Amino acid sequence: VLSAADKGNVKAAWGKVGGHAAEYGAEALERMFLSFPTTKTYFPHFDLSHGSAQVKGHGAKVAAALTKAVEHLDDLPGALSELSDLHAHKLRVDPVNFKLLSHSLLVTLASHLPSDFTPAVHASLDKFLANVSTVLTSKYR
Amino acid sequence: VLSAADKGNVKAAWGKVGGHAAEYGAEALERMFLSFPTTKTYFPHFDLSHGSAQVKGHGAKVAAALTKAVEHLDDLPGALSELSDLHAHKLRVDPVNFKLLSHSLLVTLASHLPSDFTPAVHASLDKFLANVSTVLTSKYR
Amino acid sequence: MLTAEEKAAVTAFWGKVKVDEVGGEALGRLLVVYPWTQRFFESFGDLSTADAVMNNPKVKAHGKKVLDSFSNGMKHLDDLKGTFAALSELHCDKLHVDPENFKLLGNVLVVVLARNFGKEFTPVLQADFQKVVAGVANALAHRYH
Amino acid sequence: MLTAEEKAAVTAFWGKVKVDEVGGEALGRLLVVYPWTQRFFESFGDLSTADAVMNNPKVKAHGKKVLDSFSNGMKHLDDLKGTFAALSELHCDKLHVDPENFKLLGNVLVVVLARNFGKEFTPVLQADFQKVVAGVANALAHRYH
Ligand code: HEM
Ligand code: HEM
Ligand code: HEM
Numbered sequence: 001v002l003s004a005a006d007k008g009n010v011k012a013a014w015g016k017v018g019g020h021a022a023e024y025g026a027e028a029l030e031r032m033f034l035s036f037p038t039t040k041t042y043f044p045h046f047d048l049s050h051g052s053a054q055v056k057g058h059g060a061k062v063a064a065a066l067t068k069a070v071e072h073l074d075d076l077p078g079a080l081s082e083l084s085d086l087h088a089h090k091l092r093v094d095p096v097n098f099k100l101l102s103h104s105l106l107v108t109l110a111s112h113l114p115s116d117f118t119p120a121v122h123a124s125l126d127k128f129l130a131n132v133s134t135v136l137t138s139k140y141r
Numbered sequence: 142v143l144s145a146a147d148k149g150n151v152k153a154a155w156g157k158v159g160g161h162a163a164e165y166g167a168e169a170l171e172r173m174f175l176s177f178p179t180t181k182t183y184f185p186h187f188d189l190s191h192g193s194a195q196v197k198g199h200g201a202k203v204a205a206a207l208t209k210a211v212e213h214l215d216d217l218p219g220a221l222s223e224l225s226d227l228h229a230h231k232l233r234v235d236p237v238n239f240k241l242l243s244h245s246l247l248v249t250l251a252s253h254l255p256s257d258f259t260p261a262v263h264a265s266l267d268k269f270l271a272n273v274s275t276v277l278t279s280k281y282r
Numbered sequence: 283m284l285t286a287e288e289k290a291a292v293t294a295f296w297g298k299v300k301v302d303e304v305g306g307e308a309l310g311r312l313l314v315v316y317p318w319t320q321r322f323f324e325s326f327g328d329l330s331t332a333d334a335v336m337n338n339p340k341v342k343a344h345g346k347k348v349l350d351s352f353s354n355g356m357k358h359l360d361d362l363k364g365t366f367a368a369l370s371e372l373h374c375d376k377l378h379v380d381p382e383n384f385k386l387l388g389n390v391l392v393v394v395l396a397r398n399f400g401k402e403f404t405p406v407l408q409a410d411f412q413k414v415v416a417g418v419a420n421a422l423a424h425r426y427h
Numbered sequence: 428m429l430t431a432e433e434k435a436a437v438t439a440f441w442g443k444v445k446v447d448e449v450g451g452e453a454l455g456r457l458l459v460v461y462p463w464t465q466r467f468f469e470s471f472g473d474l475s476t477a478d479a480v481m482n483n484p485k486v487k488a489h490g491k492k493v494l495d496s497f498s499n500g501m502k503h504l505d506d507l508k509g510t511f512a513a514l515s516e517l518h519c520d521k522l523h524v525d526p527e528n529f530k531l532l533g534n535v536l537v538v539v540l541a542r543n544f545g546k547e548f549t550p551v552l553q554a555d556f557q558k559v560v561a562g563v564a565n566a567l568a569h570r571y572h
């Protein structure tokens with residue numbers, strides 16, 4: 001799945017994110033923890049305070065993974081193989097949380113790319129994140 | 142994203158359905174309509190009465206589609222391409238409904254194959270139906 | 283919720299259910315079918331396989347307790363909220379289970395009743411039961427709203 | 428729900444919201460992002476494209492109405508259930524809108540507030556707003572439970 005127009009949308013959009021990718025990844029997590037406190041339960045041994053260097057640190061990891069996904073839109077399963085294992089098998093992350101993080105990410109981008117965040121870009125980004133989430137929750141073995 | 146054990150479980154289970162797939166398909170639709178009345182809004186040009194010949198007819202169609210999907214587990218996007226276009230683009234069915242029909246099918250199968258419907262089979266069938274449902278809501282940003 | 287009609291149907295059917303057996307089967311199947319739920323029961327022991335889960339003694343016992351809680355709700359079909367007040371606080375406030383999950387368990391119970399009662403578990407009866415399980419799921423997720 | 432501090436925060440901010448602008452944008456993005464929702468507005472005219480949707484006059488007019496109701500709930504944060512009783516009746520009983528869709532619109536509204544206020548739409552503020560929308564979707568799905 002994920003159509004050309006979409007892919008093209010994901011590309012320029014993420015293209016615009018450029019080098020803020022890690023600060024956005026961090027802010028996204030921060031917005032997730034604050035809006036949906038149930039999510040904090042997955043990071044018990046993490047300093048979840050505003051400005052935390054752990055969250056800062058994790059934001060970067062998330063961004064890099066999304067970036068890798070952007071560049072492998074035809075091989076998302078291939079590109080995120082490692083991560084589904086971790087999130088599904090090891091962590092046992094409830095699938096609902098993927099939706100919370102995706103929403104928190106959409107809020108963040110919109111927040112930073114008002115001119116670029118058009119209904120169509122918004123629709124493609126939604127589709128994208130949903131595909132990613134689908135991949136990460138694929139291996140509940 | 143069905144595993145070796147899953148594919149076997151689905152094929153084995155479906156094999157037990159055998160020639161009753163059409164009847165089970167009809168029963169599944171009827172349980173959906175009764176339990177989740179908001180689903181009937183998709184069939185206004187249908188006689189939804191108990192024992193309606195139209196429902197029994199539509200049931201057979203749903204069953205034949207699943208029968209095909211069971212032998213294209215490797216290429217669901219492929220075996221149901223046309224169906225995705227109908228549900229998604231033409232009827233634009235709300236994704237929540239797929240879960241209601243999947244639920245109705247599991248209830249139906251459990252009812253008819255008590256001894257065959259083991260926790261492992263249930264789990265596999267569940268994954269199968271969720272995969273089919275993903276395909277049918279594909280396009281659908 | 284249910285009319286007096288439905289309440290009667292539901293109640294009579296309920297009399298035939300063996301909560302011990304049905305309770306264990308229902309929790310076991312939740313853990314098997316929706317694996318992420320295993321996260322909440324780490325202390326139950328070995329949940330590695332479908333067979334492991336289903337024969338786990340702590341699962342069977344917990345399972346019975348869950349169904350007992352259902353039977354109580356069955357007795358108070360008009361005040362579900364009040365009947366699951368403390369249970370709501372435990373699941374939402376202490377455990378932090380996403381309310382979507384209360385829905386999953388409700389659905390699993392229906393499947394199990396279907397597996398166990400066959401032809402007796404009619405579409406109509408099932409429909410009444412969907413109402414009840416939805417009610418219970420609502421009363422539990424109340425500390426969230 | 429909203430603590431005294433949370434209400435103050437939300438209330439203070441809301442004053443800067445132009446309901447005509449934000450309402451039309453939110454309804455339009457819902458229709459664009461979640462297509463199945465167009466099923467409910469077939470009479471609004473052309474919804475064929477993103478541009479079709481965003482420039483539709485009826486879409487825009489309807490958005491304002493939706494936002495007005497929001498504003499009203501903002502005035503009665505303590506009793507959204509009562510405040511949305513009539514709308515709950517319309518959406519559930521008459522339209523038969525899956526409650527899941529009330530949540531999607533709430534979420535699109537948050538996105539649209541963020542797009543319009545940038546830096547002022549802080550993680551803290553977003554968090555207070557998530558409570559509001561959850562509160563609203565809940566009051567709308569009243570007659571469902
Ligand atoms: C957009 C979807 C997501 C992506 C791309 C993503 C990405 C990542 C990455 C790249 C890692 C680190 C792996 C490593 O290099 O060691 C990670 C770890 C982790 N993720 Fe996710 N994640 C996503 C969603 C979630 C969600 C929704 C949750 C739970 C609410 C979650 C919880 C965790 C946890 C607990 C860890 C391990 C943290 C640690 O202890 O170091 N993730 N994720
Ligand atoms: C397991 C998931 C499903 C499968 C396999 C499936 C399969 C089918 C099939 C095989 C057809 C006949 C197409 C034809 O005319 O050739 C069909 C049509 C249709 N389906 Fe589904 N379907 C599924 C889910 C749903 C859901 C959840 C809904 C809505 C509640 C729905 C509503 C319809 C409608 C309205 C039609 C067209 C009926 C007509 O005009 O003849 N389907 N589906
Ligand atoms: C309709 C849905 C449910 C009902 C009626 C229900 C009922 C109960 C009852 C009666 C208890 C006894 C408390 C104790 O003595 O520890 C309990 C405990 C518990 N519930 Fe549930 N429950 C439901 C759903 C869930 C779900 C979906 C989960 C997680 C995915 C969950 C997780 C737990 C846990 C972890 C415990 C306590 C374990 C322990 O302390 O030994 N419950 N529940």
Ligand code: HEM
Pocket residue numbers: 464465467468492493496497514518522524528529532533563564567
């Ligand atoms: C936050 C959630 C929502 C709120 C506050 C809301 C509010 C409203 C209001 C104020 C009206 C008009 C009542 C009047 O004329 O005074 C309305 C009508 C309507 N709403 Fe909603 N709505 C919400 C969600 C939805 C959703 C999710 C859908 C379906 C996708 C929907 C579909 C409709 C339709 C079809 C109408 C009537 C169309 C017409 O008669 O022109 N609404 N809603």
